[PDB]
Design a protein around this ligand. Structure first.
Ligand code: SF4
Ligand code: SF4
Ligand code: SF4
Ligand code: SF4
Ligand code: FES
Ligand SMILES: [K+]
Ligand SMILES: [Zn+2]
Lengths: 231, 94, 125, 106, 688, 82, 89, 48, 206, 114
């Protein structure tokens, strides 16, 4: 919508400078803690093949050793221009998935460092006033700009008819949308693929032969937000 | 130009006021009727007409990009002022 | 292994629509008229189905338009008159079908504007 | 600055509002000006998305800086044009400064 | 046969010779962009938005004016075509004002939409814009002429369709302005249509100004009831309120036009409305009551009278559903005095044969006539869209038109034979020269206005005119299937009432004054309490408080035509139905439900409880009344003429003078238009 | 007594041929005999011809006239008028 | 200058203008130069003749020409404002 | 504001008001539009 | 061009060839194969082919579509078979996606795909819940998203947006009750479609 | 008219499944009244069950009957497993909804709806 305010990038740099230490303090409390390990190690084990067939994604796949990350395999935006490592687990349990998330946080800091250094100049929205609204100064001076502002904010832009399934590596796994266009300016159908929908469907499987308190840890390791599960 | 009706209720700049028999004015009992008292019709009529030396003048409301879309106003008629349809400022050829 | 049903397809009992919004509603099946403010014809291609307008009253608090008609905004699009009729029948809705109006072909002749002996001659351009 | 309302009842904000939280009616004012007679925002429908202030061509409707306006009743969150105009007169000193600081990014 | 082959992007099309490139593209389903071209006006070819590339030709052609040749391949999406559109759109917008937020066309603007689809997305115009002064042309059409794009649609419409040569272009070049030059008002019964055909916000509805945007309005396709033409309309509503009235295209009735009464009188529906039942208190003043009490009072009086002691009168805006319900109710107390305010001679056949009181040629059939004789009618104000159809035939078919009556302005030149009704005797006898024109004619048409039938000698006139049609059909001039005799009605409810067996006129009520009288929307003032026993019990059912309500004992608030699904039959006998756009105000109810409810309380319950059932009843009385949008056709003109000759009634000396002579008499004619503040501004403007 | 007569018929169908012949031959003579009686003839395409009679107090009777002849139609009205 | 007329005491529909008898004879010859049924072709020469008699074209002069040739007054206004040799002041 | 005071406007409130909810000065919503349909008023004389 | 999405010709050829491959191997069920301009391959199949087609794509060595990414339904009331069942599958081996579509109406059951993908269990419950499409041989087919006792299938095009009933707490009966829906402000329907064609490349024939 | 079936291949097969559903619903009412502590009588609950079955008696399409039985069994499970709360079970009775006028005159007085 808008360009970064002047001075924002320096502040993001200041935050990113100190963040790894904050992750280090988190690990000091949990990583080697025998109580934390007793609550997580060998809890909710899922095999690589079962994870794929149950429709898992994200850390739920990578905790079982599956080498899959949509940012690597099917990159979008500029993810193919940044360097990072995908954390992979070996035992497929809650503890390995916990370590994957903590390592993914470190890699996010690594990626943020490259974005701050490689940020290029230029415009922020597609220079195409039939999709992206023109600048307010243009809208108040140019006849074409005002017309396009008026139409984009009332009818909206029309999308050519068609259907796409588009997915990204969301923090919770593969988040996708099956978007159907009928040629008008309103979507005809919009199915939302929430990564937690399939994950919560696997809770029954993952909890077999565990204690009542291990269910708490297993819903925890899947990281469920019922906003996306329920839509 | 706020004013009160016979019942003592203030009339809004839109001309709204509950009539005598209207029960809906019970909502103000023990409270107040929110009324803005800077009537725009009266404030814009206090502005002095601007004298210009051309048949056509443009108005953007002032402030450049902080105003309204720029429009051009014809001043050929000498029986009336040219008014801006966005901000209500008036112009007259001198 | 397929079976045979000689009956008329009806699903009124398995759609969950209250009874009064089946039997008392009137569906209108029509091709929308061109908005006469514009010359575009792209909004007169498909068939629509709408229902009978019901009461809208003024909300006592704000003056907003209130309604108790759950089908007040329901508009369905159909490729053909027969797709619309079939959908109305299986849903149990009584309906009126209005035949599509097509603009009659015209005879446009620019030369007629300058006729030697006919009233089609224009006095101005 | 003259005191005339910026809003010209174009209804672009009402059209773009993702929540249908804006209700507008308009008519020619006694001086022939194109102005609203109703301008309501249901603050319990609004998602505070700012789309209305992006759509407005004259900077008439804005989201101000106030966030400390919780009420004791639902009805107090159904704003009409008088309430919104009073909010403009109340907060204009700060709204104008905020707009001055950000209008070059818009 | 005589078709020729052309291609649109390679797809073969067979077109009639003379078909333009634009018309060829329609067949394959492409709409070429346009501004100046309108299919019902003359080709202008000035906007240049329709420029298209013909394959192999180096120059783009104006598709709206260029006749397509054999073997041409029209490239409607080539770069040369696309760049032509972008260039023209760039020039149209160079001086256009940045007005969309304050402009009423915004949201349904062809300039906006064709800019989005066919123009560029930005500007490179770095100068200042043209600005022009506004023109005042009446209280209906607001002009913001800086928005004008000089398409000349208004000028062509005013001259060809309305027959008014008051709009033109003055000046030259970039400073060419559309207008009247002098301070003039464009006040025509069809004037409001230039709002629709102006592609931009230059011409806009003054009453509609600033009130709504097009995306938020709900559209209800309905029927006009301001005259007997039955013009198809769209009622725009928003949040329960009627916002405006637009034409709805119907080639066989109104085409895409409506009259200024149809367009603008709708504001009368918000004034002087009956919202509650009323009865007379002990002091003789009307006071609000309940539906319980008002219906019980009427049911009590109804149960105590029989036969001639109960009568009813139907006004000009009453639906067929209400008409048959009131007939059935009074037929259960044994009353047949079901009357209308509009007279039609009951001599001879009367209403036995439908052809005796219809526009038997149909409105579309005017375009096939070669001679039209108008008798005692100002069709310009009685049936504006029927008069516009005559001018279309006059302009395009070279139609010959003669008139008997006042020499009113019809917007086209015609042969005035005089106003004395004895000319009809001369024409039929053969002495008048015009009879030679009628005999030579191969498809002649005779129209007698229903207004002329309001005279005391209406029966003699109908016999005299019906005789002329007898003469033509005995000669060989006509092919048989062609119908010559026509009655032009002016009242929306007249034809349905005649179809249902109502007695036209209030002569029966004058002959046997009733003790109880129903006024069903009757506001013509044809019967007053001076025509009734000293203690007549008058019940008025209607939607407006005008002439009937003040004198009634009981008032029953009904619905207007925008507030019910009701059947109306137009002058040619076509049955059409309205639809509910908004519900009736207050406690008002659907008119046939009031009679159905009243019948139950009176102990004479009618045998129908839904709109579908009362329409099945309409089918029993006249099957044509439920054949919506169908013109049925009536025969036995021969039998009607034989019956019309039994009784010889003489013609009065009075010259035929139509009720409406000038435009000032056109605007206010029924209760709705009499309550319209827009119509009162029109009346004031054309006098002051 | 009798109050109204309505005759329905199709303009083109053979089922209404007899009724069409009656109107073209006998209707004028019938109306002259009964000048105070509404005999509403209403044509509509594809309708089965019928004869409606309205008696006092809204009582109604309808007699099919399908595939009737002109003389058969004459008798049917004679029954109503008698 | 402008292309819209506003009545003034010097220039209004009742400003006295009429062709002299000599100019009516000239008008007859001008009109005779064109096919019968196309008298509108005489608008330009007759407006010029009005201006040659009068010096300029008051609105009343324009209305007289429209009346002589039986063309709508607007169609004479369009000619008067289109061609630059006509003096409307 | 001591260093960069706000621009002066004559419609700007001279007196700031804090939150008035729960007091007799609280805002109470109402419809700001005028009545849409004017009813017919019968005559005051009993001519009937 | 800076504002135009670039075309990938190699993936369009690749997905076309694989589309013919699947059509040649499964002719009993495949009715149509198409690839979009943004390179998504869609297989349209007869509904009887759900299990054979999905099993082939999961298990075949050149397919290996091991992950069911999504399963949803689209309601198109104008069609005789109004419901379109859409399977979106992912192949990690070949780093590719495929979409498999079939159809059904209100009374015709579709075969549960739970045997092929355990992921389908809840998706089919959601399709049943929200569209009313029955899946045969489903281990536990019941509503999943709607309230207990909810009548109707909300994602059908002819189900009203605000439904038919609404909830409130009633003091007289001391419980939450359901009543016919009334709205203080009705939802305002907008007609936004422009009357001018936007995309000639998609024009339907006259 | 050759269509894929759901369960029943004809109406006689379907009627059997309908009767089993009625038995299951009939026997569960006394438990439902007790577990949910309803304030209706067992006879009232069973009358409602009959009312719900009754208003589908006109159906002659075996596929439609199977769906009606399928839906009815799901409702029974929700009740048997106590997934429904007290509020859900009592929605069949509309206790807070005032009686709706049915005759013409009553509907004419209240408003415009037929
Ligand atoms: S901020 Fe609120 S009122 Fe403005 S557009 Fe968003 S939801 Fe609507
Ligand atoms: S606030 Fe702005 S966008 Fe909304 S109606 Fe007023 S001027 Fe238009
Ligand atoms: S005519 Fe169209 S483009 Fe011109 S200002 Fe009005 S809405 Fe905008
Ligand atoms: S006013 Fe409108 S219709 Fe007339 S020329 Fe200008 S744009 Fe065309
Ligand atoms: S539409 Fe052809 S030039 Fe205007
Ligand atoms: K316009
Ligand atoms: Zn301005």
């Amino acid at each position: 919508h808008q360009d970064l305010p002047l001075g924002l990038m320096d502040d993001i740099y200041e935050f990113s400078k100190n963040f790894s230490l904050r992750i280090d303090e988190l690990e000091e409390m949990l990583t080697n803690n025998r109580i934390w390990r007793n609550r997580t190690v060998d809890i909710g084990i899922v095999t690589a093949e079962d994870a794929l067939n149950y429709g898992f994604s994200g850390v739920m796949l990578r905790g079982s050793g599956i080498q899959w990350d949509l940012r690597k395999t099917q990159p979008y935006d500029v993810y193919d221009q940044v360097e990072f490592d995908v954390p992979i687990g070996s035992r497929g349990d809650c503890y390995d998935r916990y370590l994957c998330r903590v390592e993914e946080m470190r890699q996010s800091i690594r990626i943020i460092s490259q974005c701050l250094n490689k940020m290029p100049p230029g415009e922020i929205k597609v220079d195409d006033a039939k999709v992206s609204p023109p600048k307010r100064a243009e809208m108040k001076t140019s006849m074409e700009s005002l017309i396009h502002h008026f139409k984009l904010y009332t009818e909206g832009y029309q999308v050519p008819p068609g259907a796409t399934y588009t997915a990204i590596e969301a923090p919770k796994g593969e988040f996708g949308v099956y978007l159907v266009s009928d040629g008008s300016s309103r979507p005809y159908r919009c199915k939302i693929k929430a990564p937690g929908f399939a994950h919560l469907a696997g809770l029954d499987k993952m909890s077999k032969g565990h204690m009542l308190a291990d269910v708490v840890a297993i819903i925890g390791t899947q990281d469920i937000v019922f906003g996306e599960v329920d839509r | 130009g706020v004013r009160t009706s016979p019942t003592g209720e203030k009339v809004t700049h839109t001309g709204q006021v509950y009539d005598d028999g209207d029960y809906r004015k019970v909502r103000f009992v023990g409270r107040q009727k929110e009324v803005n008292e800077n009537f725009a019709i009266d404030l814009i009529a206090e502005q002095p007409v601007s004298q210009v030396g051309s048949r056509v003048i443009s108005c953007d409301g002032g402030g450049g990009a902080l105003g309204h879309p720029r429009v051009y106003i014809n001043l050929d008629k000498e029986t009336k002022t040219g008014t801006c349809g966005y901000c209500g400022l008036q112009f007259r050829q001198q | 292994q397929l079976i045979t049903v000689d009956e008329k397809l009806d699903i009124t009992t398995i759609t969950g629509v209250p009874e009064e919004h089946i039997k008392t509603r009137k569906a209108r099946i029509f091709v929308p008229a061109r908005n006469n403010m514009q010359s575009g014809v792209n909004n007169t291609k498909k068939w629509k189905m709408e229902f009978d307008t019901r009461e809208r009253w003024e909300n006592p608090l704000m003056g907003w338009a209130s309604t108790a008609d759950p089908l007040s905004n329901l508009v369905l699009t159909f490729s053909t008159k027969e797709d619309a009729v079939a959908f109305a029948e299986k849903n149990g809705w009584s309906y009126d079908v209005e035949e599509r109006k097509v603009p009659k072909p015209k005879s446009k002749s620019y030369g007629a504007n300058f006729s030697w002996n006919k009233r089609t001659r224009v006095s101005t351009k | 600055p003259s005191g005339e309302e910026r809003c010209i009842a174009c209804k672009l904000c009402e059209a773009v509002c993702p929540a249908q939280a804006i209700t507008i009616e308009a008519e020619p004012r006694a001086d022939g000006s194109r102005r609203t007679t109703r301008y309501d925002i249901d603050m319990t429908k609004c998602i505070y998305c700012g789309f209305c202030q992006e759509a407005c061509p004259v900077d008439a409707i804005v989201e101000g800086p106030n966030f400390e306006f919780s009420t004791e009743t639902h009805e107090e969150l159904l704003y009409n044009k008088e309430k919104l105009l009073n909010n403009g007169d109340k907060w204009e000193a700060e709204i104008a400064a905020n707009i001055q600081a950000d209008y070059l990014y818009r | 046969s005589n078709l020729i082959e052309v291609f649109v992007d390679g797809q073969s099309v067979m077109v009639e010779p003379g078909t333009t490139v634009l018309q060829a593209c329609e067949k394959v389903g492409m709409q070429i962009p346009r501004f100046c071209y309108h299919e019902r006006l003359s080709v202008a070819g000035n906007c240049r938005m329709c420029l298209v590339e013909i394959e192999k030709a180096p120059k783009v052609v104006a598709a709206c004016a260029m006749p397509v040749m054999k073997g041409w391949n029209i490239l409607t999406n080539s770069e040369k075509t696309k760049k032509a559109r972008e260039g023209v759109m760039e020039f149209l917008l160079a001086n256009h004002p940045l007005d969309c937020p304050i402009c009423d066309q915004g949201g349904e603007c062809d300039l906006q939409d064709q800019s989005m689809m066919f123009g560029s997305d930005r500007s490179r115009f770095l100068e200042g814009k043209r600005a022009v002064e506004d023109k005042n042309i009446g209280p209906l059409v607001k002009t913001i002429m800086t928005r004008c794009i000089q398409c000349t649609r208004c000028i062509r419409f005013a001259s060809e369709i309305a027959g008014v040569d008051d709009l033109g272009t003055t000046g030259r070049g970039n400073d060419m302005q559309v207008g009247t030059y002098i301070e003039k008002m464009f006040m025509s019964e069809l004037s409001g249509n230039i709002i629709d055909i102006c592609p931009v916000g230059a011409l806009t509805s003054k009453p509609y100004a600033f009130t709504a945007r097009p995306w938020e309005t709900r559209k209800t396709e309905s029927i006009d009831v301001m005259d007997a033409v039955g013009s198809n309309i769209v009622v725009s509503t928003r949040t329960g309120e009627v916002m405006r009235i637009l034409p709805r295209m119907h080639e066989d009735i109104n085409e895409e036009w409506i009259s200024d009464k149809t367009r603008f009188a709708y504001d009368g529906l918000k004034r002087q409305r009956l919202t509650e039942p009323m009865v007379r208190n002990e002091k003789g003043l009307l006071t609000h009551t309940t539906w319980e009490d008002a219906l019980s009072r009427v049911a009590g009086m109804l149960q105590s009278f029989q036969g001639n002691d109960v009568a009813a009168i139907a006004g000009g805006l009453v639906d067929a559903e209400a008409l048959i319900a009131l007939k059935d109710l009074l037929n259960r107390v044994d009353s047949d005095t079901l009357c209308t305010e509009e007279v039609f001679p009951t001599a001879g056949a009367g209403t036995d044969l439908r052809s005796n009181y219809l526009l038997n040629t149909t409105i579309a059939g005017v375009e096939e006539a070669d001679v039209v004789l108008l008798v005692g009618t100002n069709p310009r104000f009685e049936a504006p869209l029927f008069n516009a159809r005559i001018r279309k035939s006059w302009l395009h078919n070279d139609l010959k038109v003669a008139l008997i009556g006042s020499p009113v302005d019809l917007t086209y030149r015609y042969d005035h034979l005089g106003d004395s009704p004895k000319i009809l005797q001369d024409i039929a006898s053969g002495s008048h020269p015009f009879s030679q024109v009628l005999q030579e004619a191969k498809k002649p048409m005779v129209i007698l206005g229903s207004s002329a039938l309001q005279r005391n000698d209406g029966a003699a006139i109908l016999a005299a005119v019906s005789n002329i049609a007898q003469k033509i059909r005995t000669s060989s001039g006509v092919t048989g299937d062609w119908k010559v005799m026509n009655i032009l009605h002016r009242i929306a409810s007249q034809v349905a009432a005649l179809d249902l067996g109502y007695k036209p006129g209030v002569e029966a009520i004058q002959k046997n004054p009733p003790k109880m009288l129903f006024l069903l929307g009757a506001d013509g003032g044809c019967i007053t309490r001076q025509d009734l026993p000293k203690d007549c019990f008058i019940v008025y059912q209607g939607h407006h408080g005008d002439v009937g309500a003040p004198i009634a004992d009981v008032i029953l608030p009904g619905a207007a035509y925008t507030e019910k699904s009701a059947t109306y039959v137009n002058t040619e006998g076509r049955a059409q139905q309205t639809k509910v756009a908004v519900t009736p105000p207050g406690l008002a109810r659907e008119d046939w439900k009031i009679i159905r409810a009243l019948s139950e309380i009176a102990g004479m319950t009618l045998p129908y409880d839904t709109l579908d059932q009362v329409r099945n009843r309409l089918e029993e009385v006249s099957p044509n009344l439920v054949r919506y949008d169908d013109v049925e056709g009536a025969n036995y003109f021969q039998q009607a003429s034989e019956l019309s000759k039994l009784v010889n009634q003489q013609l009065l000396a009075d010259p035929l003078v139509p009720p409406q002579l000038t435009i000032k008499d056109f605007y206010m004619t029924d209760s709705i238009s009499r309550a319209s503040q827009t119509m009162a501004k029109c009346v004031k403007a054309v006098t002051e | 007594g009798l109050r109204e007569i309505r005759i329905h018929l199709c303009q083109r169908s053979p089922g209404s041929q007899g009724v069409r012949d009656f109107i073209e031959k006998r209707y004028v003579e019938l109306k002259k005999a009964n000048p105070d009686l509404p005999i509403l003839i209403r044509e509509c395409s594809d309708v089965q011809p019928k004869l409606w009679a309205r008696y006092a107090f809204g009582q109604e009777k309808n007699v099919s006239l399908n595939n009737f002849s002109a003389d058969q139609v004459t008798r049917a009205l004679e029954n109503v008028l008698s | 200058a402008l292309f819209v007329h506003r009545d003034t005491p010097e220039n209004n529909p009742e400003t006295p203008f009429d062709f002299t008898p000599e100019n009516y004879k000239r008008i007859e010859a001008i009109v005779k130069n064109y096919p019968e049924g196309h008298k509108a072709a005489a608008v330009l020469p007759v407006l010029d003749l009005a201006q040659r008699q009068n010096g300029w074209l008051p609105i009343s002069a324009m209305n007289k020409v429209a009346e002589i040739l039986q063309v709508p007054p607007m169609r004479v206004y369009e000619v008067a404002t289109f061609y630059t040799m006509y003096n409307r002041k | 504001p001591t260093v960069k005071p706000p621009t002066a406007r004559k419609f700007i409130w001279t007196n700031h008001k804090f939150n008035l909810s729960g007091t007799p000065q609280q805002y109470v919503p109402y419809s700001t539009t005028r009545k849409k349909i004017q009813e017919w008023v019968p005559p005051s004389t009993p001519y009937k | 061009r800076p504002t135009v999405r670039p075309r990938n010709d190699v993936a369009h050829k690749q997905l076309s060839a694989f589309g013919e491959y699947v059509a040649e191997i499964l002719p009993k069920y495949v009715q149509q194969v198409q690839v979009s301009c943004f390179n998504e391959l869609e297989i349209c199949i007869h509904p009887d082919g759900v299990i054979p087609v999905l099993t082939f794509l999961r298990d075949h060595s050149n397919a290996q579509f091991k992950s069911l990414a999504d399963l949803t339904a689209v309601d198109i009331p104008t069609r005789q078979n109004r419901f379109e069942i859409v399977y979106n599958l992912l192949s990690l081996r070949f780093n590719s996606r495929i979409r498999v579509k079939t159809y059904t109406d209100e009374l015709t059951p579709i075969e549960s795909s739970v045997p092929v993908y355990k992921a389908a269990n809840w998706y089919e419950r959601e399709i049943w819940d929200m569209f009313g499409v029955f899946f045969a041989n489903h281990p536990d087919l019941r509503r999943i998203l709607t309230d207990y006792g909810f009548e109707g299938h909300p994602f059908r095009k002819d189900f009203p947006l605000s439904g038919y009933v609404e909830l409130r707490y009633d003091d007289e009966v001391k419980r939450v009750v359901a009543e016919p829906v009334e709205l203080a402000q009705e939802f305002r329907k907008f007609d936004l479609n422009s009357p001018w064609e936007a995309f000639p490349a998609y024009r339907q024939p006259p | 008219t050759s269509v894929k079936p759901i369960f029943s291949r004809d109406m006689n097969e379907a009627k059997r499944r309908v009767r089993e559903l009625y038995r299951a619903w009939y026997r569960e009412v006394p438990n439902t009244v007790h577990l949910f502590q309803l304030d209706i009588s067992v006879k009232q609950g069973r009358d409602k069950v009959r009312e719900m079955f009754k208003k589908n008696a006109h159906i002659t399409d075996p596929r439609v009957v199977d769906l009606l039985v399928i839906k009815g069994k799901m409702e029974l499970e929700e009740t048997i497993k106590v997934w429904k709360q007290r509020t859900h079970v009592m929605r069949f009775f509309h206790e807070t909804e005032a009686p709706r006028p049915k005759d013409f005159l009553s509907k004419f007085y209240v408003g415009h709806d037929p």
